[PDB]
């Protein structure tokens, strides 16, 4: 896998960021994580939604550089969104949310699962530490 540069346009929710990639504005869906959402009447503004959203937001907005890392499988989902691991100053935002108990690891679709074990290890630790969602 390899990381490529991108530029923040706008943070949208815990699990989506809009980025300028290869000169095109694009919505990215954070791979392998489910964040409580601020979006969708089919739920609404769920519990920890604003928290997961502020975290991702802060993290990408305060970064010196953003990089995207596509996995081995399909790179977009049925809504036209990029499917990636997003890094802020070298830190993976998807792991960070999971490490803080602000996301659970999603149902996984091979072959897009290269960091699954890494993330499951962080989720186990957040649950042990009974953080946020695991409170």
Which residue bears the tokens 């290269």? 114
Is the distance from CB of 55 to CB of 97 less than 8 angstroms? yes
Whether the CA torsion 69, 30, 14, 7 is positive or negative: it is positive
Cα–Cα distance for residue pair 13/108, rounded to 1 Å: 20
Which residue bears the tokens 């943070």? 11
* Coil, strand or helix at 99: helix
**Binding-site residues:** 15, 34-35
Domains of the chain (ranges, CATH numbers)? 1-135 (2.40.50.90)
Is the distance from CB of 110 to CB of 73 less than 8 angstroms? yes
Which member of 29, 51, 67, 123 is catalytic?
29
Is the distance from CB of 60 to CB of 88 less than 8 angstroms? yes
Show the tokens assigned to 77.
Answer: 């989902």
Which member of 46, 69, 81, 120 is catalytic?
81
User: What resolution, expressed in A, was reported for this entry?
Assistant: 1.9
Cα–Cα distance for residue pair 132/50, rounded to 1 Å: 12
Does the annotation count 37 as an active-site position?
A: yes
Give the residue among 133, 98, 134 at the shortest CA–CA distance from 115: 98
**Binding-site residues for Ca(2+):** 15, 34-35
């Amino acid at each position: 896998l390899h990381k490529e540069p991108a530029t923040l346009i706008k943070a949208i929710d815990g699990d989506c960021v809009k980025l300028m990639y290869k000169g095109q504005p694009m919505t990215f869906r954070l791979l392998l994580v489910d964040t409580p959402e601020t979006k969708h009447p089919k739920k609404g503004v769920e519990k920890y939604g604003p928290e997961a959203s502020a975290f991702t937001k802060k993290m990408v907005e305060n970064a010196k550089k953003i990089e995207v890392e596509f996995d081995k499988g399909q790179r977009t989902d049925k809504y036209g969104r990029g499917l990636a691991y997003i890094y802020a100053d070298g830190k993976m935002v998807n792991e960070a949310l999971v490490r803080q108990g602000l996301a659970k690891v999603a149902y996984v679709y091979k072959p897009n699962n290269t960091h699954e074990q890494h993330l499951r290890k962080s989720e186990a630790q957040a649950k042990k530490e009974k953080l946020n969602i695991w409170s």
